[PDB]
Structures are given as structure tokens and as C-alpha cells.
């Protein structure tokens, strides 16, 4: 079986995977809504109790068996074999959601080469009538339909939403984004087609790239003190949101989305080496760095609005509240148009999203591909090169549901429901099985030898009580509080909300499905089927 080799080359694969575009959108867009600075205090308390146990669990269970994602449950609890297929099915939905976003950053990269970008003037190809973002000598007129050139650069240039009215009607097939889907899976194929050792000698420079972007990007914002006056009024103490829970339970879900365990990705990473006396160091560093990365990620975005809020003379609440994804594309686009430092930070910025775009696509794919190949020796022997390509042929087939439709209604729909009860139900069943059914007392017998110390006093309380505790609040509150979404002033039909609800519900139907086949085929009495199925007890 393959091996990683160098130490830091293994860690940086997890660093780049933990960082995600979702943390660039969900964290800042939700922070100010929950009181700004008052959102940071749950983010720290919920990360220690909520972020640590589920993160290291996939890293703990993977560093004990080294047999992929499906066959791993054949040893401890054979009844839970259906969790692997549940990860593969749910991974396909987010794949179509995640690859469509990369095409937008790639499409703007080709347009960023021009020195005179199409951001300072709405030319004769857009809805130029509503272009009213020009801070002249008191000549601004806010109206109901007033928009920005960056908004039209995002609302109709690439989306072309004016054609499609809703989910009841589809638009055209824009070949602009279709060419972008080729470049995405192109770079990902050459990395995985060669082997796993190629990751050790390719992506060890990509992890250092995006962290330098936030560094230089903050220095440019600090040139004028006018931007500093905005962040001061941004981080004021808004403690009224602590009592009223609202979406306080969602604040813990953002940490679960930031780290994102249970996808069989960290499992396949730790599936190639024991990592004796250095695995616990990888988890502790990844937690604190993600806590700082998301903080520095949002800290630089709102620093841009501080300068725009000066000339606008308006609260940051009214600006960029209609959607989450619309914040980044409209916020940064207005900065380079006003700042005289264009032609330099344009190309440097869009490569950040593309660099993180390739990281999670390659780092996340290794978990799904490593699973099925382990149980198929006739495929892993000779047909490894052909089978991995067959998975890529199915990937973009689902992505065309959003591109060919000509509308971002699949985007806003798959934001909450794809990562909603789908991932949550699968992640809960993993922790409940390893802890309650499988003897945790016997689990720490061998893991302490690899760690060099008894993991008690920190792991005995978390996985037992804290792990099934925080996970229960999201699933119950999500049903009792349907998050009615909106996209560019368009209320979804009630019947369409059931579509996103049944897909997320039916995504993990395989778990209760294959359990029945394994038990019905097993002869004997009812008690024997449980003992024969669950081997520890």
C-alpha cells in the first residue's frame, strides 16, 4: 500500500483541506448577523467541545485499521457497513455544488488580465441603467432597483438570471462555464492519475500560497486610516443576541462545516501510516490554525467595507445582506475599482479561491477513491487508472444540473440542505457506534501505545457525552425552524422546499437499507442476528 513520506507534506494536505471557500462565506456573512463580536465567543467555546472530538474521531478511527472507509466497519461493527456508501452519495451532491463555484473564480481570472477592468464603467453590454455606484460630489440616488457594477458583474454577467424566472423553468447552456469545468477536473486528474506520492511533491507549495494573500491584502487596507474607522464600529459589543438563541445552534454547525469530519477524507489520509507520537500534534495545530484562519479570513473582508462605508455613510448591515455568496464577489470587486492599485491584486486575488478550490477537490477526492479501491482488488491491481477516470466522468454529469439550467437556484438550495441533516445524520451514527456499542475502554488500550500516554481525562468525557449532545441540537432545531431561503428577491415555492428536504433525507437511506439485507439473509433467532451482526456484543 502507498505511503506519504515527509511529515509536513502530510499535515499541509489537512491544512489546505480544512480551509474552504465555505469558511470565506458562511463565517463572515453569519458573524455580523449574530452580533458580530458576540459570534466569536460561541465560536471558541463550541470549537473546543464541539470541534475537537468529531475532528480527531475520523483521524483516530482511520489510524487504527488502515483498510479504507467501507471495510473499516467490517471489524468493529459490521452492522454499520452502510456509512461508506452514505459518504459517497452525499459527496456527489456537494461536488456539483463545489465545482460550479470554481468556474466563477476561473472565469474572472481570464478577465483580470486586462489593465482597464470592466468595473469602473458599465459598458454597452450590461444593465447599465441601474449602475449607480459612483461616489461623486453628492450625486447618489438610492432606489429600490439601484445596483452596483459589481452586482451586475455577478447578477447578470455570469449568472444571466434574468432569463430563468425560477425552478419551474430552465435557461440556456452557457459554454463559458462549460469550458471552466474542463480545467477544474483537468488539474485534479493529473495529480491523482499518477499516484499518491505525487501529492508529496506538488501541493506542498500550494498550502503556503493563500496565507500570504491575507497578509498582503490586509496591509493594503491599512494604508488609509479611513478603513480603520469602519472595523471599530463593526466589532462593537452586541450582547443582546446571546440570550435569544436564534441560530446560535447554527454557530456550532459552522465549526462542523469548517473542519468537516466524517467524510472519510482524514481516514484515507491516516490509512497509509501509523503516525506514532505525532498524530495528536497534527490535530491540535489544525484546530487552532482554523480558529485563526476563519477569524483572519473575515477580518480582512470587512476591512474593505470600512473604506466603502466612509463615502457611503451607511451601516454595514444594509450592505451585502441579500445572499452569502454575493458578498465576496461584490465586496472585493468594488475595492480594486476605487483603489489605484489595479492590475496587480486582481490576478493575485482570484488565484486564492482557485488554489483552495484545487486543494479540497483533490484532498477530498482521496477519501472516496481510497474506499472502493481497497475492497476491489481486481480493480486496484490493473484497472486502477481506468476506474478512477470513470468516477470523474460521473462528476461533471451532475454539475450540468446547475450550469445547463442557467440559474443559481441549485446553489442556494444546496447550501443548507446538502450539508444539513444529510452529513449530520451520517456523522452522528459514526460517533454513537464507536463509543456505545464498540467498547471505548478497549479502544484506548492500543491507541495509548501509539500516543505514548493514556488518552483519559480528555477523551473519556467528550466522545461519550459531548459528542452526541451538540449533534442533537442541530437536527431537532432544523426541523422545528425551516430556514426559508431567498435569492435575489425571490421566495421559493413551498413544494420546492420539499425537494431539498427529501434529497437530503433520501441521501442516507442506504444506511437503514443494507442493514435489512444483512440481517434477513442471516438465519437463526432474533438475538443471534444481533450477535452475528455486531461481533463485539
Amino acid at each position: 500500500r502507498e505511503t506519504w513520506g515527509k511529515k509536513v507534506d502530510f499535515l499541509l494536505s489537512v491544512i489546505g483541506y480544512a480551509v474552504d471557500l465555505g469558511n470565506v462565506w458562511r463565517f463572515p456573512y453569519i458573524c455580523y448577523q449574530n452580533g458580530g463580536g458576540a459570534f466569536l465567543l460561541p465560536y471558541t467555546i463550541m470549537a473546543i467541545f464541539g470541534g475537537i472530538p468529531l475532528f480527531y474521531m475520523e483521524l483516530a478511527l482511520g489510524q487504527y485499521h488502515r483498510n479504507g472507509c467501507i471495510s473499516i466497519w467490517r471489524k468493529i461493527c459490521p452492522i454499520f457497513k452502510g456509512i461508506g456508501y452514505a459518504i459517497c452519495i452525499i459527496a456527489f451532491y456537494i461536488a456539483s455544488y463545489y465545482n460550479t463555484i470554481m468556474a466563477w473564480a476561473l472565469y474572472y481570472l481570464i478577465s483580470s488580465f486586462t489593465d482597464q477592468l470592466p468595473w469602473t464603467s458599465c459598458k454597452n453590454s450590461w444593465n447599465t441603467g441601474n449602475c449607480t455606484n459612483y461616489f461623486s460630489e453628492d450625486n447618489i440616488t438610492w432606489t429600490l432597483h439601484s445596483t452596483s457594477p459589481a452586482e451586475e458583474f455577478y447578477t447578470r454577467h455570469v449568472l444571466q438570471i434574468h432569463r430563468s424566472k425560477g425552478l419551474q423553468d430552465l435557461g440556456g447552456i452557457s459554454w463559458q462555464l462549460a469550458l471552466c469545468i474542463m480545467l477544474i477536473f483537468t488539474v485534479i486528474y493529473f495529480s491523482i492519475w499518477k499516484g499518491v506520492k505525487t501529492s508529496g511533491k506538488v501541493v506542498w507549495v500550494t498550502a503556503t500560497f493563500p496565507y500570504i494573500i491575507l497578509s498582503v491584502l490586509l496591509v493594503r487596507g491599512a494604508t488609509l486610516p479611513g478603513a480603520w474607522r469602519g472595523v471599530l464600529f463593526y466589532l462593537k459589543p452586541n450582547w443582546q443576541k446571546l440570550l435569544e438563541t436564534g441560530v446560535w445552534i447554527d454557530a456550532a454547525a459552522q465549526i462542523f462545516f469548517s473542519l468537516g469530519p466524517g467524510f472519510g477524507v482524514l481516514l484515507a489520509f491516516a490509512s497509509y501510516n501509523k503516525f506514532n507520537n505525532n498524530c495528536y500534534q497534527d490535530a491540535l495545530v489544525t484546530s487552532v490554525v482554523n480558529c485563526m484562519t476563519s477569524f483572519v479570513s473575515g477580518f480582512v473582508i470587512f476591512t474593505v467595507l470600512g473604506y466603502m462605508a466612509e463615502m457611503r455613510n451607511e451601516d454595514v448591515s444594509e450592505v451585502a445582506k441579500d445572499a452569502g455568496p454575493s458578498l465576496l464577489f461584490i465586496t472585493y470587486a468594488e475595492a480594486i475599482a476605487n483603489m489605484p492599485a489595479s492590475t496587480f491584486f486582481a490576478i493575485i486575488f482570484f488565484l486564492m479561491l482557485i488554489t483552495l478550490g484545487l486543494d479540497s477537490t483533490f484532498a477530498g477526492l482521496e477519501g472516496v477513491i481510497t474506499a472502493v479501491l481497497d475492497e476491489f482488488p481486481h480493480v486496484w491491481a490493473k484497472r486502477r487508472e481506468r476506474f478512477v477516470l470513470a468516477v470523474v466522468i460521473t462528476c461533471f454529469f451532475g454539475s450540468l444540473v446547475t450550469l445547463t439550467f442557467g440559474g443559481a437556484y441549485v446553489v442556494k438550495l444546496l447550501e443548507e440542505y446538502a450539508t444539513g441533516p444529510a452529513v449530520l445524520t451520517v456523522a452522528l451514527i459514526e460517533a454513537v457506534a464507536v463509543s456505545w456499542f464498540y467498547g471505548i475502554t478497549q479502544f484506548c488500550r492500543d491507541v495509548k501505545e501509539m500516543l505514548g500516554f493514556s488518552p483519559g481525562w480528555f477523551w473519556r468525557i467528550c466522545w461519550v457525552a459531548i459528542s452526541p449532545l451538540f449533534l442533537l441540537f442541530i437536527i431537532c432545531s432544523f426541523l422545528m425552524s425551516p430556514p426559508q431561503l431567498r435569492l435575489f428577491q425571490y421566495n421559493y415555492p413551498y413544494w420546492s422546499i420539499i425537494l431539498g428536504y427529501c434529497i437530503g433525507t433520501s441521501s442516507f437511506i442506504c444506511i437503514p437499507t443494507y442493514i435489512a439485507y444483512r440481517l434477513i439473509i442471516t438465519p437463526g433467532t432474533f438475538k443471534e442476528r444481533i450477535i452475528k451482526s455486531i461481533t463485539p456484543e
Epitope: 469602473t120 464603467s121 459598458k123 454597452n124 453590454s125 450590461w126 444593465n127 447599465t128 441603467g129 441601474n130 449602475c131 449607480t132 459612483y134 461623486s136 450625486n139 447578470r156 444571466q160 434574468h162 432569463r163 440556456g172
Partner: antibody, heavy 118, light 110 residues
């Protein structure tokens, strides 16, 4: 509504220079794209160029760039055009055009009375 | 440059009958679901007066006689029974940059 008033005519000489004017008013001149058009007896229309008071971006074609030079000043609320090195073929009438916005296809709604380049 | 042609060159539109004028072209100008093509109304001495927005939507200040529709590189300016005051030569506009061109023209008469 329509206040696109040009200046008077001018005599054409071989190697002359003309300073055509147009009063931009009656609408938001600081957001639309002005244009110019040629017309002669027994011939059709033809596009000349484009300009924006505030930015100054101009794009030419149709062999007009050899002497075309558009200028605009947002403070004056006008738009000018300089055409040096004229000839007999340049004798025509020019209308002060104004295209609409993309909500309806960038159609030319308002027009001027026109000045005869005799 | 976008080529623009029109035919027939002279239409003898009698009183009480429709009209049909097309705008052929090489492109392929359909972008953003709004075909960049329009029609003007040029009389002797008067300036151009707009007729239709995007060759599909009737405009303000114009009678309800004018209309247009089609798909691809071939449209048609379907008009209601003509009135004697609507006599004017019509050109086909092109607003797709960078270069813009106008059609040849057709004389509409009785």
C-alpha cells in the same frame, strides 16, 4: 425632456477644423453613453464613436478614427467633437445621439435638431 | 464588422395591408437573451424616431402597429395595416460592440 441643442453650421475648407457642440440635459447625462451619426442626401446612416462624460472612453471604426476626436466635460454638461482635415465628402449633417440602457436593448431614444456641415 | 442587408428594396404597402421587413446578418448576435437589433423611423428632414425596443417590445410614443419577433439570423418586422403618415425609411440597428453597423434600407411606400 429633449434638450440636445447643437451649435450652428460651419464652412468646410480643405484642412479645416470644426468644433461641434451639444447640450447634455433633460436626463442623467453622467450615466449614459453619447454617440454621433452621419447622414447625407441619398445615403443612409453610419455610426461614428462613443464617449462618456466623466471617463472619456472612446471606440472608433468605419475609417473615422483617422481624424475623430471626442471630448466631454461632466461639469459643463456638454459633449464636443473635433474633426480636423475635412474634405468635400465630409459635408453632411450630424445628430447628437444618445443610446438607452441595457434594460431595453440600448436603443437611441433622444436626438438633436442637427447641424449642417456645409 | 457585422454585415447587414435588407430586402425587398422598395415595398408598395397599400392601405389596409400588413408589411414584412427583415434584417439578415452573418452573426450570431444573440447574447444575454436580448438580440441587439432595433428599428428607427427616418422621414425627410426629421431625425430618427425609435419604433421597437430590442425588436420585440413596443415602445412609448409610437403607435401599436409595429411589432417584431423571430429567432436566429432572420427576423421580420410585422406591422399592422399601415397609415399614410407612417411613410418612412427604416434601418436595422446593431449595438454589439466594438464596431457598429446599420442596414442598407428599404423604402416603404404605397
Amino acid at each position: 425632456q429633449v434638450q440636445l441643442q447643437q451649435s450652428g453650421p460651419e464652412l468646410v475648407k480643405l484642412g479645416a477644423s470644426v468644433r461641434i457642440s451639444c447640450k447634455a440635459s433633460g436626463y442623467r447625462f453622467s450615466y449614459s453613453w453619447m454617440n454621433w451619426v452621419k447622414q447625407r442626401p441619398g445615403k443612409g446612416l453610419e455610426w461614428i464613436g462613443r464617449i462618456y462624460p466623466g471617463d472619456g472612453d472612446t471606440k472608433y471604426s468605419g475609417k473615422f478614427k483617422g481624424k475623430a476626436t471626442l471630448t466631454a466635460d461632466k461639469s459643463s454638461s456638454t459633449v464636443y467633437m473635433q474633426l480636423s482635415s475635412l474634405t468635400s465628402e465630409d459635408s453632411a449633417v450630424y445628430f447628437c445621439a444618445r443610446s438607452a440602457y441595457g434594460s431595453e436593448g440600448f436603443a437611441m431614444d433622444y436626438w438633436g435638431q442637427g447641424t449642417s456641415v456645409t | 464588422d457585422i454585415v447587414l442587408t435588407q430586402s425587398p428594396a422598395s415595398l408598395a404597402v397599400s392601405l389596409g395591408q400588413r408589411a414584412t421587413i427583415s434584417c439578415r446578418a452573418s452573426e450570431s448576435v444573440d447574447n444575454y437573451g436580448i438580440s441587439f437589433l432595433n428599428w428607427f423611423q427616418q422621414k425627410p428632414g426629421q431625425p430618427p424616431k425609435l419604433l421597437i425596443y430590442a425588436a420585440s417590445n413596443q415602445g412609448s410614443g409610437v403607435p401599436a402597429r409595429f411589432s417584431g419577433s423571430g429567432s436566429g439570423t432572420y427576423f421580420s418586422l410585422n406591422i399592422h395595416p399601415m397609415e399614410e403618415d407612417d411613410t418612412a425609411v427604416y434601418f436595422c440597428q446593431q449595438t454589439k460592440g466594438v464596431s457598429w453597423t446599420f442596414g442598407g434600407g428599404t423604402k416603404v411606400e404605397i
